[PDB]
Amino acid sequence: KTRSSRAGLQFPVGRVHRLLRKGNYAERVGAGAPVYLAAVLEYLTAEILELAGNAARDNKKTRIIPRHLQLAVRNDEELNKLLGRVTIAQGGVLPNIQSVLLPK
Template identity: 70%
Template structure:
């Protein structure tokens, strides 16, 4: 007895265990967006010399959240229709303040135009500018605003924009 191995069966491998299924990084993170593909694109795009293991997971989660948010709002805009068209995506983005700030400059092909309502016909809003402490408190209470804040900080760090 050499002491090495410790295998009881005639075949190689771990004793008493069947073959384990390989699990994708998307499945491990509980995401639908492809983490491996995003990792490959980050490496191929020369955004940085090296790409960490957590960066594509985080980016996939942010992209999945944004896609779900846009599709939810577009689905609400397309309540009567049987399907969600491009014009519903355009309406969803333009009518939401935060999404419009993020994607306001994006042109959606065949998206149509957003109906314009003159400001005189809209109800008056009397709001004062928030202080830094009030803004941070509102971020803590609003989950959606917090995610957008993280998104802006992430893109600022990665792409040096904003």
């Protein structure tokens, strides 16, 4: 019985407990901490795959590529802030042209 199944999680509690020890963050790592962290991490993955899947769909694609991840993140105020100092390779920018630059 994995601690993953036991917490209702697809992400690996055994690995996250492990990576927390290996990384010298504190002297002791409590039993709930890796459970809570694997949940947060899965929550956030699920959130970004949702938005990215949609972006895939909006462009008639069934395969998520980096463009989709980028549209997902940059179009979402919160993921955009959280990843405001990150660069997604092969993601491009958002189509945006400043008003004054259009003719009249």
